[PDB]
């Protein structure tokens, strides 16, 4: 059945410039991060639901299909996990700062032996960001190591033929490594009208205060089922199904 | 609980599901963003400048028995775009029930 979170405050957008929200397939955004970053300190939808006590466990989980045809395209479950979408047991690690769903990255290693973030860095787990992002210069390095060429502004491309032979990249999160094979981190698109492959890593620096940060976006979540546990303030990963 | 919410996948770039705002509910598709903390949808009072609401759904306050005005102005900047409007209050149904 649905829930009805009542007396939720939301904004009504009257001006939104740029190509971005014109092109975007979606009408708006429901943010599910911490109230600490809420504009006008509005109480967020999950916090209001939580307060109203409408779910037994204050957790929510994402499954995202990586096949464009495959229905359902993904599944969010409000108040529990779904076992047909992941396999194994979930691996948890705690939130390091409560604003975004921020977590500690131990290091990122391209198999060839390019180790980025050796010494550890910070990452936010974000369902609203399509690709993986990381600091410009570090990502450039990563990109050249797997032979992707620049398009514009930190977006990279690989001739689709090569996908099948690139190195796997491992993100070590909380002890164990999470592995992204080439077909996981490349997106087959159609610019002009043709089969092109986007590199699934784009470089963009987030300024301090909050930055510099890696952003584990849908590319990651597309391979590893993610649970956001507001009750324990920990993120949980498992290989998807 | 638990409430499954089916998302649509668009190019492995955009994942979005449907929610309803209002009594009776008006149905909006939204990304459930773990990277921000606000809910907003276009208003029917959007400026002709907002090319985005020429083609997205627009929330019409007058058709909701549960609408409480608020009027405070917000402004949000995403890595991908900014926007602004005024805040309002109503019932959110996940899904459009």
């Amino acid at each position: 059945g649905g829930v009805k979170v009542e007396r939720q405050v939301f904004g009504e957008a009257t001006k939104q410039p740029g190509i971005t929200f014109i092109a975007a397939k979606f009408d708006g955004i429901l943010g599910m991060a911490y109230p600490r970053i809420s504009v006008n300190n509005v109480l967020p939808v999950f916090d209001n639901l939580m307060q109203q006590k409408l779910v037994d466990q204050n957790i929510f989980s994402f499954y995202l299909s990586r096949d464009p045809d495959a229905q359902p395209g993904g599944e969010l479950m409000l108040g529990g996990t779904d076992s047909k979408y992941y396999k194994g047991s979930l691996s948890y690690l705690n939130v390091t700062r409560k604003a975004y769903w921020q977590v500690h990255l131990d290091q990122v290693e391209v198999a060839s032996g390019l180790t980025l973030c050796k010494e550890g860095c910070e990452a936010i787990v974000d369902t609203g960001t399509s690709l993986m992002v990381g600091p410009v210069d570090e990502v450039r390095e990563l990109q050249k190591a797997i032979g992707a060429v620049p398009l514009i502004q930190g977006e990279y491309m690989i001739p689709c033929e090569k996908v099948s032979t690139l190195p796997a990249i491992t993100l070590k999160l909380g002890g164990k490594g999470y592995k992204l094979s080439p077909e996981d981190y490349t997106l087959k698109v159609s610019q002009a009208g043709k089969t092109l492959c986007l590199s699934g890593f784009m470089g963009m620096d987030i300024p301090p205060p909050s930055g510099p940060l890696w952003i584990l976006g849908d590319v990651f979540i597309g391979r590893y089922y993610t649970v956001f546990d507001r009750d324990n303030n920990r993120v949980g990963f498992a290989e998807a199904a | 609980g638990p409430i499954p919410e089916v998302l649509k996948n668009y190019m492995d770039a955009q994942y979005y599901g449907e929610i309803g705002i209002g009594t009776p509910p008006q149905c909006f598709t939204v990304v459930f963003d773990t990277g921000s903390s606000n809910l907003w949808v276009p208003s029917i009072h959007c400026k002709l400048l907002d090319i985005a609401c020429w083609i997205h759904h627009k929330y019409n306050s007058d058709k909701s028995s549960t609408y409480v005005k608020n009027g405070t102005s917000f402004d949000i900047h995403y890595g991908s775009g900014s926007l602004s409007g005024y805040l309002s209050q109503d019932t959110v149904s996940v899904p459009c029930q």
Binding site: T20, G31, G128, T129, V133 | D33, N38, H77, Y78, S80
Partner: peptide
């Protein structure tokens, strides 16, 4: 792409 609240 799209990177959502800086």
């Amino acid at each position: 792409x799209v990177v959502x609240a800086x």
